[PDB]
Amino acid sequence: MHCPFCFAVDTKVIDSRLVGEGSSVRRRRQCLVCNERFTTFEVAELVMPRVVKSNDVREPFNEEKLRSGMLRALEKRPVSSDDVEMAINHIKSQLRATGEREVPSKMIGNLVMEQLKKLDKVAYIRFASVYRSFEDIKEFGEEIARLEDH
Amino acid sequence: MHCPFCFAVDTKVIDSRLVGEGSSVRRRRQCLVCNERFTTFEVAELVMPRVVKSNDVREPFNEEKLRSGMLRALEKRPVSSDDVEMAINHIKSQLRATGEREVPSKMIGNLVMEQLKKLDKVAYIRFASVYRSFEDIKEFGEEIARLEDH
Amino acid sequence: MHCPFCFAVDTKVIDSRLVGEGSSVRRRRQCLVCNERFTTFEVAELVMPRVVKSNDVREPFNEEKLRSGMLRALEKRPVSSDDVEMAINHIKSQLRATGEREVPSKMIGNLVMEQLKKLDKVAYIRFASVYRSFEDIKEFGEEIARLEDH
């Protein structure tokens, strides 16, 4: 970290302690050139990454939007709410594993599709019909044929 | 009617015309105090037969249940809200024409399918996949073959 | 209004009453052919047109965005909140008077500048500096010259 006083590039960590019930790291740093001392805080970014929509508008990640889309596709299917919640938790872990501040809605959609393939193939076709915006009934056959290769 | 802008107690009807295939009256009103103009719609509020559900439980006719089911199927389809409202008016009209105190769920779903077959074929498949509760992915092709056959 | 029972094109209004604290008109209509009676409700359409942004993205009309921009321009200016609210009401009235489903944000901006020119000329220049996205300081004098005519 650069010194906030003289802007020398190397600062030394002289002390460290956990704060905020172990969720943050409070440090004491010392400038090697101007010898000034200062406090720093290390805080995690726990909020989910923002979503870049199809029209390039950014909006905060909305877990209810993700879930309600899956529940429309899973209508009348033999998938428990625990299976859906585990699938949502897996999608959320993958989004966080990217390390990105923002992720395109296309990444969320692709991740939902993979979970739906494992959970219920009828639900997968229903979701794909909207996510891939089918304009002709021919597209159902094409999506099914693709699924039948794997 | 009171002015929705300045809350003056009387408004003058400046223009009137039949809309919704003669089922509604669209009016243009003008406030005599603030001179603002606005549009109003006059719609009938009729008694609808009760709905006998698949499990034989009776429940009142719920126009929102009818509408939301259609809108799920019509996602991203080029059908206007006016086309949907005309389809809903036609469905409600047919249920009323039976003269029955109650009508089965199946009759409503069947009537919706007739409308969706005229409005959008992709919507028809999406609705049929839930209404006819598809269990295998091959049921999409079979519904397509049947749809194209009538 | 057409009869919802026999579909005769003629129904006579036999009674009228204000409901919803004067905001709606309840009518009792009678078909001249089948003599059946039914109730109707007349309600106003208070929907501000959607906004077409500079990048062609549509978004609902947001009164707070409109006001927030004017209050930035009016900082430290002798214009009362009543003057601002009357200016906002006038802008909303003009957008509604277009009869359009959607209006470009450019129309909203032009309308706010028209109000700001009447309210406070300093505010007008401040708003124009962002609305017209000034890239050089010479644009302030250029905007003043344009105003110091009409």
Added chain:
Amino acid sequence: MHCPFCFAVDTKVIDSRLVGEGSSVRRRRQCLVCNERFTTFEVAELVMPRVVKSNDVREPFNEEKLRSGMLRALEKRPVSSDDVEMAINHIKSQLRATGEREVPSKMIGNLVMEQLKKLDKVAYIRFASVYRSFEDIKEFGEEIARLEDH
């Protein structure tokens, strides 16, 4: 740092990198038990002199009041958030170099103007129009003249 997901006590720092033009440390941390990965930011928290407002009331130094004013002036200007954060860090460094327990509002305003003069001249005029509370439109030209005289 403790894992914010499973609450295991010692997350491993798997990556570290300077951000915000060297003023902050971005870390990537991994829990050794649940294997979840998350991002953290290390930022300095410095003691700052109190602010003596125009009415002689003292109030603690509020970085957000300083930043939000600059961001209003920098609207639609080609200045990155890193340039803004470096300007604020420079302001903070200069206020600390005075050694003063309290500093007048006027000193902060003048220091912001010196940074805005380097970052963007349009932003400088916008800020000056409110900071120097322009009462008439000729003050814009007068400020542009004093500015173009360095």
